Structure 1
Amino acid sequence: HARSTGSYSLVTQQPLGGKAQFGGQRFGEMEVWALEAYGAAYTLQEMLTVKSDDVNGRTKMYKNIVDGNHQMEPGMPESFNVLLKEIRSLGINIELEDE
């Protein structure tokens, strides 16, 4: 199995999982410790945002790749904004802060 691009889930925009659906492989928890254990930071940033979750960045990435520009704009993943609202849907005011 292999996936360039295709479906994304509705609640959070991460890719579907499967062969019965054209899914992307889970870069699961242990793999992230494995990247962190190399120095590899940019790989990780990509793997869990641009390749994955950032609804802007992935379409800007795709176009930069067809243009062959080899550059990314990383943003902030929409699954994390899901978390904020799911906490803020408790009476817990969590918020992003500036300084």
Structure 2
Amino acid sequence: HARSTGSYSLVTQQPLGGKAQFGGQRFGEMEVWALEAYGAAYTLQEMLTVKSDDVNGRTKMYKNIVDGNHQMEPGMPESFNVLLKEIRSLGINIELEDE
């Protein structure tokens, strides 16, 4: 089976996992290492923020593909912000310096 575009997990805004859920494949850290072995920078960035997390990014990419421009517009992954808030819930202040 294959997945082009479907639902997402509510907590992390990432595509679900499983054929029965019409989900998408897993991209394990092994794959991340394999890409890093090559000079695979642009592909890694494209996969890890545009095809997975950035809702604004993925919507913009979808529209650009519709109009025929294959230009990435990378953005901050949402799961990272989820981790930020989760840590903040532990009383440990975490901020992003020089925004």
Classify the TM-score, shorter chain: over 0.9
Q: Which runs of 4+ in 1 moved over 3 A?
A: none
Rounded Cα–Cα distance in structure 2 between residues aligned with 1:19 and 1:28: 17
- Kindly state the Cα deviation for residue 55 of structure 1 after the two structures are TM-superposed: 1.2
SS of aligned partner of 1:5: coil
1:2-21 counterparts in 2 under 5 A? Answer: 2-21=2-21
- Kindly state the Cα deviation for residue 50 of structure 1 after the two structures are TM-superposed: 0.2
Runs of 5+ consecutive residues of structure 2 not aligned to the other structure: none
Rounded Cα–Cα distance in structure 2 between residues aligned with 1:22 and 1:96: 36
**Structure whose residues are more often strand by fraction:** 2
Runs of 5+ consecutive residues of structure 1 not aligned to the other structure: none
SS of aligned partner of 1:82: helix
What residue is the counterpart of 1:75 in the other structure?
A: 75
- Kindly state the Cα deviation for residue 49 of structure 1 after the two structures are TM-superposed: 0.6
Return the TM-score normalized by structure 2: 0.97
- Kindly state the Cα deviation for residue 9 of structure 1 after the two structures are TM-superposed: 0.2
Rounded Cα–Cα distance in structure 2 between residues aligned with 1:33 and 1:76: 21
* Paired residues, number: 99
